[PDB]
Design a protein around this nucleic acid. Structure first.
Lengths: 215, 225
RNA sequence: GGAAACAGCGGAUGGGUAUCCCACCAUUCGACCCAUUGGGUGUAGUACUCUGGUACGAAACACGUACCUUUGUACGCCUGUUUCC
């Protein structure tokens, strides 16, 4: 009745020039009625392969697809930099149609340490009554990074939020913002606001800070 | 040449109603199957509905059947998805898509619309406040410092941010929105610039929040001392 | 030989019939096909149907067309059996 399409891996970090193999297993026979799509962030998907193995017009010949029973694979024989994307399989053998859950492909590169900036809240937001302190981690690889907030040496937990950019188009790095949210009253109670970072590119943790009200 | 332009997305309360339309140009939908596919923020593609040519037969996903109705107006060369009794899990970017010709691309969806975001929520629309991320008031650390704008407490998504009306684009990072415990989003946009010329150069971040018809411009300066 | 009528898968056994075969029945006993309270099984023939498919038509279903298959009807053909002439 329903057909599931189990796609693996869910993510993959590969280098330029690597062969890439993405697989999709149909929970029962979907004959050859399988298509593959490429989606870049914020964009609509584009068709790559239709009928399990036919290359769609306009698509480079390094993309290919094949079928063996209920296993369908998308191969990129030599990963190119424009090939960073999420790939999806889809069965159109029966209604309802089913997509696979996607494989997100990202590009390896050399380790890059983050450059760190601390941001005190603006006087205008202080007028409203809340204080946002921001820590910027700029242009690092790999993605994994640690931010700890300290206030008068006292460790903060659960009053911060993080946001990570997608991998950059050229340098394949990420950036991260961490925002410390406190009421203005608690902001004026403490003196030292600091942001400390741990990353693979740093031999020792890095600290940017300020003293509340230093013009 | 072939295009699919969608419209009609927006914010709707649970239990509410919305009609999406998909205006085709460069082909006529009466010769093709039209599909709707959606993608929850940060999730995969999910097929929603399709309508077959010549018979008008309709198909729907398990979760939306009986609530959604797909149709095609061949006189207007436009397809529609009428969504009734919306729930929060229906929140998604909605695409219409063309199933290609049987002899040319099998059943692949060879053309896609740009997508329209449908947000299902009880929260009311709320415009953002924009606050500056002030440049380094201390000396130069690495030759350059960083500045930006914080865009806080808006609903629903999205906000778009540019700098100097788009003339300045190199080195900008606009972060994904974070949903605060208040139920409102916030995001930051930052840029890295040579600290040597902070006080002699105009930095305006251009914040656009279409769902509230809000546009804000913020000059960025280091403070008194 | 000529009509006209009826019929057409395989045993075995029995009965009669033949009295050898052959026919002719009964009974069971099989086999194969099919759309399995059943029905079909000389025919590599035709044409309509129906069953289920293949393909195409800008076409996953419906619709149209073509072909294939199945069912069943006629029709033609072969083989018999009977009655005649």
């Amino acid at each position: 009745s329903d057909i599931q399409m189990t796609q693996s891996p869910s993510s993959l970090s590969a280098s330029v020039g690597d062969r890439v193999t993405i697989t999709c297993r149909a929970s029962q026979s979907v004959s050859s009625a399988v298509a593959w799509y490429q989606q870049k962030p914020g964009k609509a998907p584009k068709l790559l392969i239709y009928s399990a193995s036919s290359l769609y017009s306009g698509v480079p010949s390094r993309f290919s697809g094949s079928r063996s029973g209920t296993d369908f694979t998308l191969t990129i024989s030599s990963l190119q930099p424009e090939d960073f994307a999420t790939y999806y399989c889809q069965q159109s053998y029966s209604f309802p149609s089913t997509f696979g859950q996607g494989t997100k492909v990202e590009i390896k590169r050399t380790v890059a340490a983050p450059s760190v900036f601390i941001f005190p809240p603006s006087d205008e937001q202080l007028k409203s009554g809340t204080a946002s302190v921001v820590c910027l981690l700029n242009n690092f690889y790999p993605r994994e990074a640690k931010v700890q907030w300290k206030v008068d040496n006292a460790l903060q937990s659960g009053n911060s939020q993080e946001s990570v950019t997608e991998q950059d188009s050229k340098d394949s790095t990420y950036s991260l913002s961490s925002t410390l949210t406190l009421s203005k009253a608690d902001y004026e109670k403490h003196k030292v606001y600091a942001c400390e970072v741990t990353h693979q590119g740093l031999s020792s943790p890095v600290t940017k800070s300020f003293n509340r009200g230093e013009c | 040449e072939v295009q699919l332009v969608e419209s009609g997305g927006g914010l709707v309360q649970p239990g509410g109603s919305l009609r999406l339309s998909c205006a085709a140009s460069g082909f006529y939908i009466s010769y093709s199957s039209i599909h709707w596919v959606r993608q929850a923020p940060g999730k995969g593609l999910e097929w929603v509905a399709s309508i077959s040519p010549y018979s008008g037969s309709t198909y729907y996903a398990d979760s939306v059947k009986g609530r959604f109705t797909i149709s095609a107006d061949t006189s207007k060369n436009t397809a529609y998805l009428q969504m009734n009794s919306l729930r929060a899990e229906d929140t998604a970017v909605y695409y219409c898509a063309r199933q290609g010709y049987r002899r040319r691309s099998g059943r692949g969806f060879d053309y896609w619309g740009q997508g329209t975001l449908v947000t299902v929520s009880s929260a009311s629309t709320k415009g953002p406040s924009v606050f500056p991320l002030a440049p380094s008031s201390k000396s130069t650390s690495g030759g350059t410092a960083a500045l930006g704008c914080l865009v806080k407490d808006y609903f629903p998504e999205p906000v778009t941010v540019s700098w100097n009306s788009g003339a300045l684009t190199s080195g900008v990072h606009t972060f994904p929105a974070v949903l605060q415990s208040s139920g409102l989003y916030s995001l930051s946009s930052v840029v890295t610039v040579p600290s040597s010329s902070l006080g002699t150069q105009t930095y305006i971040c251009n914040v656009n929040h279409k769902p509230s018809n809000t546009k804000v411009d913020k000059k960025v300066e280091p403070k008194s001392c």
